[PDB]
Nucleic acid binder design. Structure first.
Ligand SMILES: [Mg+2]
Ligand SMILES: [Mg+2]
Ligand SMILES: [Zn+2]
Ligand SMILES: [Zn+2]
Lengths: 589, 589
DNA sequence: TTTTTTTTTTT
């Protein structure tokens, strides 16, 4: 009823942040400075400020958003007149809607209401253009008149042509004029419900969402998103009714978020502890007893090294880990934990994957019969982590497809007239069993591993797990029963905090190698080669890749403590962990 | 509103270039010599000469080009009246527009503006004809009238037939008259964004462009081009509404550049150095330590020999290189560098390619129902370099598809009623691993290589790389760490100018064989054949192909120094490099 | 039916 434009403007200029620093005033000039033409607000803050305004947004969304858009636009023009003639419309987006509904629980009662859905992005289409105001010319020898067809109204989702010329009142031919037509960016995406939300024995459901204007290209497939907007029915093929008054539903996205200053203080506070490295390792798979050297290795792969890009070549910065062990050694359980804690990870099984599905697949589009590309698991994991369980179960002729993606971090396809190259910069963690299921100490190491030396040299670290019963059985049994009894280990960083810590470290820390670290690494690498040549029978080869493994591991150790330099202490830790890897495969040092 | 035709004419007639030769009057001078009806003007030159004139082209391109082009036509007629009755309209193409937009960043605000896009050409269609002014006959026994349908306007993108006869005002049926219709050449192409600008975890995007009149057949697939023109929305089936008022965008090309005299003297200056060959070799893969003999071999393949075309046959002039080595010997890094410095190169892997994708594929169009050919990797690489990494991972029944393309440089297809023969004159560089991952010195060369003798004989040079940990580890380790520390080797030819040097040499240099070079090559071949008879178990056969390899290598060495003939020094170098090849495969002379 | 790359059952 009443106008809240005065309230909205006053709220923007008078709201107080956590430190009462007016967390909203400094967003306005940032909008003006960068001409971002999109401003977001929090529903909790609006409700905390004025209860009446929050309800009107949450209920009368379709008749108040343009009103607040006009009021905000006027406030921008007075603040900076130069904003005019560059941006003709500014959008305000509301987040944190209390109306959250599961994807499977949407009913007809929720149509037309501002709701929020949490799911997984699966498909994204290229950006296109949608007409919201057309212009036609009446092709009738008497008219030759141009007019905007939808009068005082946006063009509906169905493209409708005028039947009677408004300028002359007669029918005839109408020709669209693209020059005078107004367009808006338009993208279509598909969202899927989370695996933990799917009911027993059923496939996950999917919903179609539409992103327009500045919301296009807001996320990539495989992301976890929270989308807010209005639901509506979909009219796709109305040319022929064919009975079937049944319709699907789709969502007009108003605000989207993927997956902060307070968190940064928490992250930096953690790094102040001298024993942060040991504290982080203790937080990796808290439900698994022992395997301290494995948890340390897995922690390094989460942080990785520093990729180097030069004018003529680039160097891999990711760390690859291979684990071989007897059944029941908690290999799969540890790998599942990595998927949860990594900011971006893809979990695959060796038997349930193919060569085309891992890198890229060439498929024939049924509508046109033309071949095109589909991204594989490694491509979708670019910048993240790829987990391959049961690597020994894959066919050897099929496993070689990942050799290029594991060192050059690229995928090359030359099939059916398609030549393409794709980036696959991801870290690979793989697990498997020995050749005879269990490790046989009588036989050498070569026949136990049963893998070609080419793939073995690609892995920075290799650990062989032996399940040897001994005095430690009682400790293991007590630990497992405590887990089943609900007792939880304390003094460990929670998974949510740990994920934020890793994401921050991988984005703002780039350690550099000092002179002291160079001498230690060089001496140790020379020592490997001399020792390796003494026993030319092991299946492990000390190639120059091993030298680069030491550099990557050293940078990861420094990056774990948010250090900008690789001191001698990190080099010693990198050398020490490499020693345990060599002792595992029976290479003494 | 000021008349710019006078400004244009004085700009063309009076302009000073960097060389001080009035660059812009020679182009129009050659315009009438060859009747090319197209003039190229740089945006930097017009802006410097007249800032106001340059701006008017940028923002008023729609209604300034016909006036600007019309003014140029009158000037040409004054220069030579003979241009009349040969060319009706002359097009002016503007390049160097500062408005450069990435392919993924195009939004609605860029529609109708002159922009420039850099990308890769992937698809070209055959040249067709487009109607811009039709002629119709009213089939109604009283009319028998001819009229150009679109009055004072060209035919739009969508063909439209008149509904009311302009000659009588009555409806009816109208018949097109092809002989009185005005046509224009039309071609469609697809541009793909470069792999550098593709975001993480996303597939590359594509844009459709239209070439008309003299711009047709101005490029070939795989080229890197810059296109300037106007964006517009694409209409395909406007008659069928089918809801979904969402359109795709295409581009009307106004000028195209495919990726000068100052380079000629720069290249000539480089060739004057007596040690130019060493400088070129030292500039191949600067980030790789050692492997001097492999760097020399890769340099030869970039330049290549001299193809011979005779009345009854032709002789291959390309050089093929095969490298077999232990894992971690930087084989893939060098191949990556070659794919960047080569003016035209295609990079493929053994596992990610098929027989059809390498040579040619037969694809059926579901619309018409007929079969047609699709160019493979080797066909697209004609006149350039083809890189096939991990060649040993190819299926043997699939690898044999390149036997004829490597020697006869042709692709023969007899499939689905299609018999064809395509040129595949491309050099092949391949790498792979021995049978057991690493070379075993305790076993003969026969079972280490694991490749048929038919394909081995087709390679001019074969190098077996052994990773022997010796006393050079410290030097190798220090070099690698220096690379990781940002240190760069100095006194090398950078990749950009090195690419220009190779392109110039392969185009203007055709060395000849002298009498003294013939004697050295003949004597060496006799000894090579005699020595091979000692060991017949080796899978390396000295065939007459090896004699022609010596000729090709000798020509390549001369081509490096831009020499016009092959002297005894070039023959000696060819013998020396051939000797190292034989020693590696176990033939000692 | 036909060539092609893909997952699938069945020749
Ligand atoms: Mg398991
Ligand atoms: Mg390699
Ligand atoms: Zn009208
Ligand atoms: Zn008529």
């Amino acid at each position: 009823q009443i106008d809240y434009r005065d309230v909205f403007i006053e709220f923007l200029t008078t709201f107080k942040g956590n430190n009462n620093q007016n967390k909203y005033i400094e967003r306005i000039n940032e909008l003006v400075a960068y001409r971002k033409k999109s401003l977001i607000i929090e529903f909790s803050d609006v409700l905390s400020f004025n209860e009446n305004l929050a309800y009107e947004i949450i209920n009368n969304t379709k008749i108040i958003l343009p009103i607040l858009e006009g009021a905000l636009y006027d406030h921008i023009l007075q603040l900076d007149p130069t904003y005019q003639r560059d941006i003709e419309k500014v959008h305000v987006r509301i987040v944190g809607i209390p109306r959250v509904i599961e994807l499977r629980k949407i009913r007809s009662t929720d149509i037309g209401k501002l709701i929020t859905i949490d799911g997984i992005l699966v498909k994204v289409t290229p950006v296109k253009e949608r007409i919201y105001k057309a212009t036609y010319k009446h092709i009738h020898p008497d008219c030759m008149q141009e007019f905007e067809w939808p009068e005082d109204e946006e063009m509906p989702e169905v493209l409708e042509m005028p039947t009677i010329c408004p300028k002359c009142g007669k029918p005839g031919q109408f020709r669209l004029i693209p020059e005078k037509t107004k367009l808006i960016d338009w993208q279509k995406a598909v969202i899927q419900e989370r695996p933990e939300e799917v009911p027993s024995g059923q496939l996950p459901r999917q919903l179609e969402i539409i992103l327009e204007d500045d919301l296009v290209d807001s996320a990539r497939p495989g992301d976890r998103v929270k989308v807010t907007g209005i639901l509506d029915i979909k009219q796709d093929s109305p040319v022929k009714r064919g009975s079937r008054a049944v319709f699907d539903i789709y969502m007009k996205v108003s605000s989207i978020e993927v997956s902060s200053e307070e968190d940064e203080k928490k992250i930096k506070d953690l790094a102040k502890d001298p024993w942060i490295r040991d504290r982080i390792i203790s937080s990796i798979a808290p439900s698994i007893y022992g395997h301290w050297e494995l948890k340390e290795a897995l922690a390094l792969a989460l942080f990785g090294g520093v990729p180097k890009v030069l004018e003529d070549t680039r160097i891999r910065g990711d760390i690859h880990i291979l684990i071989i062990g007897d059944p029941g050694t908690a290999k799969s359980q540890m790998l599942q934990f990595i998927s949860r804690v990594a900011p971006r990870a893809v979990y695959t099984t060796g038997k349930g994957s193919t060569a085309a599905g891992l890198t890229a697949a060439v498929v024939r589009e049924k509508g046109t019969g033309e071949y095109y590309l589909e991204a594989g698991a490694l491509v979708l994991a670019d910048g993240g982590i790829a987990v391959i369980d049961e690597i020994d179960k894959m066919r050897d002729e099929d496993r070689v497809a990942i050799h290029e993606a594991m060192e050059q971090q690229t995928v090359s396809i030359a099939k059916a007239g398609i030549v393409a190259k794709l980036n696959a910069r991801a870290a690979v963690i793989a697990a498997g069993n020995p050749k005879f299921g269990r490790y046989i100490s009588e036989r050498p190491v070569s026949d136990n591993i049963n893998l070609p030396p080419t793939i073995l040299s690609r892995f920075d670290l290799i650990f062989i797990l032996k399940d040897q019963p001994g005095e430690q059985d009682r400790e293991l049994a007590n630990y497992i029963l405590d887990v089943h009894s609900g007792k939880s280990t304390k003094n460990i960083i929670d998974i949510d905090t740990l994920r934020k810590y890793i994401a921050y470290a991988r984005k703002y820390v780039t350690p550099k190698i000092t002179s002291e670290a160079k001498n230690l690494i060089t001496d140790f690498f020379v020592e490997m080669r001399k020792k390796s040549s003494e026993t030319p029978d092991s299946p492990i080869l000390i190639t120059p890749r091993q030298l680069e493994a030491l550099i990557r591991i050293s940078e990861a150790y420094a990056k774990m403590a948010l250090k900008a330099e690789v001191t001698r202490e990190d080099a010693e830790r990198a050398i020490n962990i490499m020693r345990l890897f060599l002792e595992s495969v029976g290479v003494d040092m």
